[PDB]
Amino acid sequence: TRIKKISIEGNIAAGKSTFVNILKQLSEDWEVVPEPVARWSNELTMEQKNGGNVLQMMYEKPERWSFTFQTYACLSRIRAQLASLNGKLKDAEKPVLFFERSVYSDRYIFASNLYESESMNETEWTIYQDWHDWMNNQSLELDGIIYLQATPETCLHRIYLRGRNEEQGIPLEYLEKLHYKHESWLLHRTLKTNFDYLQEVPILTLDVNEDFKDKYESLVEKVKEFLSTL
Amino acid sequence: TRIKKISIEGNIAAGKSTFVNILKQLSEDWEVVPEPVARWSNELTMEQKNGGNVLQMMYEKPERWSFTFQTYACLSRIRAQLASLNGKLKDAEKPVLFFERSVYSDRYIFASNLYESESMNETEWTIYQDWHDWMNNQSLELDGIIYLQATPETCLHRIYLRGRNEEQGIPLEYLEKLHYKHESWLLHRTLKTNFDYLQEVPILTLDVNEDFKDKYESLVEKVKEFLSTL
Ligand SMILES: CCCN(c1nc(-c2nc(N)cc(N)n2)cs1)c1cc(-c2ccc(S(=O)(=O)N3CCN(C)CC3)cc2)ccc1C
Ligand SMILES: CCCN(c1nc(-c2nc(N)cc(N)n2)cs1)c1cc(-c2ccc(S(=O)(=O)N3CCN(C)CC3)cc2)ccc1C
Ligand SMILES: O=c1ccn([C@@H]2O[C@H](COP(=O)(O)OP(=O)(O)O)[C@@H](O)[C@H]2O)c(=O)[nH]1
Ligand SMILES: O=c1ccn([C@@H]2O[C@H](COP(=O)(O)OP(=O)(O)O)[C@@H](O)[C@H]2O)c(=O)[nH]1
Ligand code: NA
Ligand code: NA
């Protein structure tokens, strides 16, 4: 019928990749769009080569590369989400496509934070928002959001568990800032965005502080209940 | 009926703005889309404020700002061309929309030159081409190109005539490089592009070395003949 679009949102290492890989196996009517940045973080596609280069340069000099990184990350996401939307689930009874994060996380979590940290200047940030408004303004609109809610401490521990060398330098303070932004957007719903429909979009908040890899049935039950309301 | 899309191409100060302002007055069926960069080069729209800032920073440090400038210039153009295409000439018998330059000049003249001058690195250039392929690949396809052909010397003289302070530093050598690229693309048709239809698109080449502001009737006659063949 019509594909339901659900974004999975949450802090770094909250368990989004883990959770979408669990979901994808439970139904032939369920597909996932993994986050391009996540696939850059390891044959290589031209996007993966560009992505790996711009991530490495980001760790070296964020105030030079934030604009180039954020625009390519967002383009890459829109391309990947559109491909799944136009490629998959045509023969499905109750099709659901789970996005690992969204164009809204790109702008309101990550790019916003880089502007706030002076890694983009005002011109870079205003050009980025202009580009985003227009790049979007031409189908990916969400039917719902699933917020995987973990403490900054849980997330710092999970960065340690995941063991990517380049991330071991990420401090608690950065995770706390991103946490505050997620809480404002998806819990308090205090964040003003340029996308009117978002203030109305249903949100399912799931506490993922407890390990769920072998014990996820209650989380999935909440997902199925949430889906039946949309 | 269907709007004919004609790009006006040529080197800096060849007389494109002059020529499109002549054309627009000759027919109610004729409209023009002036080049965004040209309107940045002087109430202010957010695009003009961003544009003026990024042009000034470009003159100061092209190897920092070339990618940001080229992506915003190309977005701005696509937005302006689409607005005219969807806004204007609905009640016209023989509608023609004259583009001041194109998305192809953006990439194959200007961005290509900045890459060739090491003002973009390989990642910046590959991300730019990826973005361009995709940003276009989703209506603006040209029915024809009008090439205003002037010598580098004519163009350097016309930069002096036009008198913009920031351009008086542009050397003949830069104009010669851009001239060679226009000759390869539009005269020899040696330039390989990623847009198959372009090798087929009709091109009208007009010699504009002689001043035409009070003596343009022969040029316009060639334009009307060219239009009748499309
Ligand atoms: C694992 C996180 C990766 N990471 C980032 N990801 C994204 C991202 N953007 C998307 N649109 C999607 C998406 N999925 N991800 C944006 S930035 C990233 C983060 C740092 C970074 C941050 C902050 C500190 S800090 O707190 O120490 N501090 C702050 C104050 N000031 C500057 C000094 C440094 C260090 C280092 C760098 C390099 C990347 C690449
Ligand atoms: C009037 C030209 C404006 N100009 C430019 N326009 C565009 C443009 N892009 C579009 N997509 C559309 C569009 N309409 N225009 C791109 S760049 C521009 C040019 C110089 C510039 C160039 C070359 C030399 S050089 O030859 O002296 N040399 C070269 C070797 N090396 C680096 C050292 C310097 C100087 C200065 C700068 C700053 C802008 C802003
Ligand atoms: O219940 C969980 C959820 C996640 N993880 C681990 O926490 C790290 C981060 O998870 P993930 O990659 O899914 O986080 P994302 O950044 O995608 O949110 C990984 O090493 C996971 O294996 C875990 O041990 N138990
Ligand atoms: O036949 C002409 C064509 C142009 N110009 C002048 O040459 C300069 C550059 O023209 P234009 O702005 O049209 O060039 P573009 O950069 O748009 O090609 C301007 O000062 C024009 O008034 C001129 O004197 N005679
Ligand atoms: Na599935
Ligand atoms: Na007209």
Q: HEC states along A137-205? A: HCCCCCCEEEEEECCHHHHHHHHHHHCCHHHCCCCHHHHHHHHHHHHHHHHCCCCCCCCHHHHHCCEEE
Method: X-ray
For B73, nearest residue in chain A (alpha carbons): A127
Question: Residues of A170-182 as b/e, b for ≥16 C-beta within 10 angstroms?
Answer: beeebbbbbbebb
- CA B166–ligand 4 middle distance (angstroms): 16
How many angstroms away from the CA of B157 is the closest CA of chain A? 33
Atom of ligand 4 nearest to the CA of B210: 1
Amino acid identity, residue A186? L
Q: What distance in Å separates the CA atoms of residue B8 and residue A124, rounded to the nearest whole number?
A: 30
Amino acid identity, residue A95? P
Does A46 lie at the interface with B, CB-CB under 8 angstroms? yes
Q: What is the DSSP letter of B165?
A: G
Q: What distance in Å separates the CA atoms of residue B34 and residue B100, rounded to the nearest whole number?
A: 5
Atom of ligand 1 nearest to the CA of A119: 32
**Distances A43 to A47, A48, A49, A69, B4 between C-alpha atoms, Å:** 12, 10, 10, 22, 43
Q: What distance in Å separates the CA atoms of residue B83 and residue B3, rounded to the nearest whole number?
A: 13
> How far from chain centre, in Å, is Cα B48?
18
Helix (H, G, I), strand (E, B) or coil at B117: coil
Does A72 lie at the interface with B, CB-CB under 8 angstroms? yes
Q: Whose CA is nearest to atom 13 of ligand 2?
A: B37
Which of A54, A72, A130 is nearest residue B46 as measured by Cβ atoms? A130
Q: What distance in Å separates the CA atoms of residue A139 and residue B43, rounded to the nearest whole number?
A: 34
Q: Indicate yes or no: CB of B134 within 8 angstroms of CB of A75.
A: yes
Sheet holding B30-33, edge to edge: B30-33, B96-100, B4-9, B144-149, B203-207
Helix (H, G, I), strand (E, B) or coil at B66: helix
Helix (H, G, I), strand (E, B) or coil at B44: coil
- Phi first, then psi, for residue B150 (nearest 5°) are -130, 155
Helix (H, G, I), strand (E, B) or coil at A110: helix
How many helices (H) and strands (E) would you count in chain A?
A: 10, 5
Other C-beta atoms within 10 Å of B107: how many? Answer: 22
CA dihedral A169, A175, A177, A179 (to 10 degrees): 170
Q: Hey, where are the domains in chain A?
A: 1-230
Does A174 lie at the interface with B, CB-CB under 8 angstroms? no
Size of the A and B interface in Cβ pairs below 8 Å: 52
Q: Are B100 and B32 in contact (CB under 8 A)?
A: yes
Q: What distance in Å separates the CA atoms of residue B52 and residue B70, rounded to the nearest whole number?
A: 13
Does A47 lie at the interface with B, CB-CB under 8 angstroms? yes
- CA A182–ligand 5 middle distance (angstroms): 27
Q: What distance in Å separates the CA atoms of residue B86 and residue B84, rounded to the nearest whole number?
A: 6
Q: Are A97 and A84 in contact (CB under 8 A)?
A: yes
> How far from chain centre, in Å, is Cα B37?
9
Q: Are B163 and B42 in contact (CB under 8 A)?
A: no
User: What does this entry list as its resolution, in Å?
Assistant: 1.8
Q: A109: burial class by Cβ within 10 Å (0-12, 13-18, 19+)?
A: buried
CA dihedral A145, A146, A151, A154 (to 10 degrees): -130
Q: What distance in Å separates the CA atoms of residue A43 and residue A99, rounded to the nearest whole number?
A: 24
> How far from chain centre, in Å, is Cα A151?
17
For B123, nearest residue in chain A (alpha carbons): A50
Q: Are A128 and A71 in contact (CB under 8 A)?
A: yes
Q: What distance in Å separates the CA atoms of residue A167 and residue A151, rounded to the nearest whole number?
A: 17
The dihedral region occupied by A163, where left means phi > 0, alpha psi between -120 and 50, and beta the remainder, is left
Q: Residue B229 has which token pair? A: 């063949």
Which of B46, B68, B131 is nearest residue A75 as measured by Cβ atoms? B131
Q: What distance in Å separates the CA atoms of residue A102 and residue A140, rounded to the nearest whole number?
A: 9
**Distances A27 to A19, A192, B154 between C-alpha atoms, Å:** 14, 35, 68
